[PDB]
Amino acid sequence: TPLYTDNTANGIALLWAPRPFNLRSGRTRRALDIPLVKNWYREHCPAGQPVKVRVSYQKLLKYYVLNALKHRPPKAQKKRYLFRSFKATKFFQSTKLDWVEVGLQVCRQGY
Amino acid sequence: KSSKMLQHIDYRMRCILQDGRIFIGTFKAFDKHMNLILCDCDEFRKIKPKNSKQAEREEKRVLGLVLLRGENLVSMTVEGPPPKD
Amino acid sequence: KAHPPELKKFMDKKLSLKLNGGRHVQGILRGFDPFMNLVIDECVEMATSGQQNNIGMVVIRGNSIIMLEALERV
Amino acid sequence: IGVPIKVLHEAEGHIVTCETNTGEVYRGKLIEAEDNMNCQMSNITVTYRDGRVAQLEQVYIRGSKIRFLILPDMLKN
Amino acid sequence: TYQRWQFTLPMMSTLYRLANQLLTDLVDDNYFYLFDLKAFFTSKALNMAIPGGPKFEPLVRDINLQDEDWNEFNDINKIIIRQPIRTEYKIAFPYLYNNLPHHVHLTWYHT
Amino acid sequence: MEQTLPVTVYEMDFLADLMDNSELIRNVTLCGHLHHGKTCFVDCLIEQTHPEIRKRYDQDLCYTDILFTEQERGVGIKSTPVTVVLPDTKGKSYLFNIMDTPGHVNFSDEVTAGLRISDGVVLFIDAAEGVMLNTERLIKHAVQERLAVTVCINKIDRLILELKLPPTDAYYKLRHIVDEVNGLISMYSTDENLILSPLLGNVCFSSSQYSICFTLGSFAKIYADTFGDINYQEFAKRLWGDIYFNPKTRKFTKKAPTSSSQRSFVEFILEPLYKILAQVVGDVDTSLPRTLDELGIHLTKEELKLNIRPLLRLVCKKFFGEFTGFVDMCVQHIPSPKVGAKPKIEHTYTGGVDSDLGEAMSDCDPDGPLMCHTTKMYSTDDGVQFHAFGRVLSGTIHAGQPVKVLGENYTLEDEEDSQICTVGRLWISVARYHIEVNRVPAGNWVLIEGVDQPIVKTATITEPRGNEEAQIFRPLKFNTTSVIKIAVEPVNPSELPKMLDGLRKVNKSYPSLTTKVEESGEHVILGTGELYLDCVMHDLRKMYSEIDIKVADPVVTFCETVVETSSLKCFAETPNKKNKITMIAEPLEKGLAEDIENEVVQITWNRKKLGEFFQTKYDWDLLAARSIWAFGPDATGPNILVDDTLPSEVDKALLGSVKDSIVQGFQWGTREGPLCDELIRNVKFKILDAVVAQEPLHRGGGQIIPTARRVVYSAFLMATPRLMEPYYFVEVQAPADCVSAVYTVLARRRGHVTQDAPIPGSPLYTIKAFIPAIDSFGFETDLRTHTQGQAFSLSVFHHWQIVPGDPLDKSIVIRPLEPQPAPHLAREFMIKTRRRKGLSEDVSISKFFDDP
RNA sequence: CUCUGGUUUCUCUUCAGAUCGCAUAAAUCUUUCGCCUUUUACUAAAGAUUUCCGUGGAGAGGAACAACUCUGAGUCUUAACCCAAUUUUUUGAGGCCUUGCUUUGGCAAGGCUA
Ligand SMILES: Nc1nc2c(ncn2[C@@H]2O[C@H](COP(=O)(O)OP(=O)(O)OP(=O)(O)O)[C@@H](O)[C@H]2O)c(=O)[nH]1
């Protein structure tokens, strides 16, 4: 067996890549549930930055801490689904539309 | 099957040596050579009793935990069932 | 396997050797092989009469070795 | 390697009794037990076929010329 | 349903390389010494602000150090001053520098 | 017994049966540097012996570091004993009493306590960091404590997954670590019989995270199992150390063939390990199944779906199996302890080996006198009752059997520090569960209930109505000195008794803690460092006493000395107006204090050898060399008392009549000190004259001792006095870049960088420096925060140095809340510590004279 | 050599204090604040409850194709060629006589042999 192959350094780097890049399997999340800059403002502020951005960093951290501290575990629901109930009703039907078309539809309906 | 020894394992067993001694103990282990492991083992010389009205037991010796080398083993029969312990 | 007997401890020591046939000799261990064949130097036959006779350096085949006993401290 | 052999090696450092093919009975501390049943022992009491006893500091008996060994009951568990 | 996934190591390496720009390339949490949620919890509970950290309202009603009346204990004629005991020291060792450490969180030591 | 215990490979009955046979008992202490793998190694041994307890996949189970503070902080805080039955590579089981010790440098008292009752030391060395501060200190301590030592190089997977070094350079790194260890051992030990080398079996290679542990013997045994014809012992003898393999001849040589063949170690041990790790980590989905098939390792589909790290741990566990190399190491190279008993009694027991009890104990048989020795005190989770943990050197402890407990101050003449007690229950302490037993024979470790009351730190437990010539084992000698000092008071004065109980309990729990009450009614605690004192305060405030406690700001304890001979020879007389003493004071020579402290000289010596040393080494006249009386506050103190009294002026018999009283006065004076009531260091007090009264009721007792102290004080004050500051030795492990930042932070605090070097084989640097203890407060957090956590430091007490200023200067003016410049730090430190102690405002060189 | 267990998807019922969620909203009440001039709207910390945006587990029902890889189980259990002078399927330890002991039978010692 050869000592090292084409994809050995890559695996070794993945061993220390940050989450989720250290995994090789798992579940699927929501685009809302995936924040991209949370790790950006969790870090120290870059040196030589203006006071307004510094305070932005500080307040972002403040609200992150507040959410983390006030978190409480969810409660035991019974798993009732609003849109499943609507579909079960007879006043609604399903179709596949372009998102922009649905957006114009919703704008008109709201008006 | 290989079972012919493994069947009698844990049982009380009457083993006959090449000099003609009788070793009775709990058969707990064996091997390729038939080296045997005998727990709570006693040795008899004069007889194997079948209810000898005079007495059943003469020259009995308590040995205890015995390892017998297979070289010197001749044969084995079932003497009694396994003690539960 | 093809193991050595663990006898380095007994090398160049005076020993008492019990052999088959009720035979007994005494001498200094000079070497051995995996069969437990021995080289014994300054060997002496301990005749059943009680008399002892010097036979010099000898080979004892491990086959016929019953028991050995050190006459020294190892 | 045999199951009984492993149990023998387990008795190294314990007081054991050994009978030879010639019926001499050696009791003392088992120092070393080899795979082939070669046995190094110390501070022995030997009981010959005539009944007489003797005392030896150091012995080594060839495996082939052993009839059997008695080990402690400390091992049975 | 698009609920679970299991990728292969070359895929994972390529995705990591592409995402590189969004990741800080940190292989340890030594960076966040006194800058993680636990240190922030301690600072909040003690109503102190890490220089770069957030700043909350006092969890308890702060002890005014103009309130204690100069006992034998807190006499200032006995105190040898070498370096001003900064807030970082009190967060680092909450039980050696604080009186009344309540709802304080111990912080992971070096890794 | 019959208590409930977790499922185990072995059986408690067999454990008890082994306990009787002292030739199969191995008392070992696991020690090393911080975070070097000791706790995870113990965890993995526990997993091997307890198939039910299992380490979590992404979280590491410890099974030591049980305390809440330990779990939260991540650093072990207390030593933990574990008694197990581990098999040998040959298949023979032994009983292992393994005391896992903390790695942090502040908690070295736990390590010393474990050493006192251990017979062997296993030193864990990280494969990437190498030899560090605590490793050096612990090697020194173990060789000085006369223990056999073996080494385990842990975290060898860092060389493959972090530095990704080539096999040959990884081998070079390991060889360099071994050479460093051997150098240190030779430096600290005269005897060369203790040479560490894997060929001999004194060194093992381990990776505790991925469950790997082996010696040359064990990895040759694996080859023997795969191919049956090898003698793994000879194979192991040939593997390591510049022995190249010739495959054409199938023979090994000291000469390299082809000029490109790697050593047999690299060819056979290292390279396949590299291959296994690389294949698991990089090609898990392409050829890993084939490689495991080649290795004979078959793993279930549920298993092979794991992430990389759990998969690595599982595969390596399956390949290697048990930690038999460790057992081989310890069984071969650590006494029985039937063999190791005699050095233990020679070193520890105060009555000496030659004593009849010395022989009775060096025999180490269960059927003899009882001579238990308790070094640790473990508190029940409720924190109410303590249990004494100690070793049984002779006899047998029986539950319910009355015993006699002797404290550290007991002597065969002063028979009042003893007390009869009754032992309730006995335990065989596994880390997270205690086996209750009925008895414990000699040569084992035991937890004893009901004997905690008459002891504080260390005790010896004997039997009443016997052993009338029984003496106490020497109290623990600690690797360092507790210097940092804090003051403690309750918030509500109504709850003082609770705080007092807490103080007593923490004093019992922490071996090196010193709690005392000053003259001003201030309760003071002495500790080694800030983390140490933080843990102490947490335990006091939460575990033992449940009240609110205020803590004063940290401060260090200073010492007092002189820099030149007394201006005039001072004197005093007894309240009786007889018994006149006359003394002088001078400074000692360089290094003499170090000799006395390190026991290079002992007063117990015969005056012949004592004068021989004094005359040959430090250029003294034998007249003075044979005129020594005392060695400072203790038998080993840094101040000397000579009596220059010529025979023509004082009757030597009369002087010897009050020798003991004058010695007591001298020792008390040195212990207290006039400047600030703190130890006096590095001073030679010379009795120039002693007029001794005639009658014993006119001399001795309450006449000479006060006069002796007053003369000592006057002579010291006449000699130019100075304060001495404790100094900490700091070692920082930083990146190649942050060295300048370390320089800056240290320079901000009166620091002085002694050295800065690279760590061979690693991209990091070690910066060694000296800091003042009083400025050291907050230094480590300053460094870590300023450098963004990339630099880490550990500090330890090194030596005493003179504070820059002149203390007894009344010209200077001090403001209450300003950091003073250097030229009067002495005056500030003296006045403020005087205030703390509650003494007068200032001390005058005439205060203790008889004239004013 | 054979028998279970499949996968995807739709819906219903019920438990979940597990980072049920590697993210994060709103409302009400209480206490303590900003104040305060009344309602909305609020200010900022704590405690409690609720609703919404989302889950996992188990059971039930439906409908689409794969049906022995895997999980196990029923099955743990082998033959072509060559071999034994320390531990059993080749082992030359073979005999006799005398003496002593023993109620005899029987046991111990020496010698003779080829
Ligand atoms: N890479 C690698 N890391 C390890 C290995 N073993 C332990 N560690 C890590 O080293 C760190 C030190 O943890 P422990 O070994 O449990 O701590 P310790 O050895 O008891 O040292 P103390 O905390 O001072 O008692 C842990 O966070 C582990 O994750 C190893 O074999 N390889």
Ligand SMILES: [Mg+2]
């Ligand atoms: Mg630890």
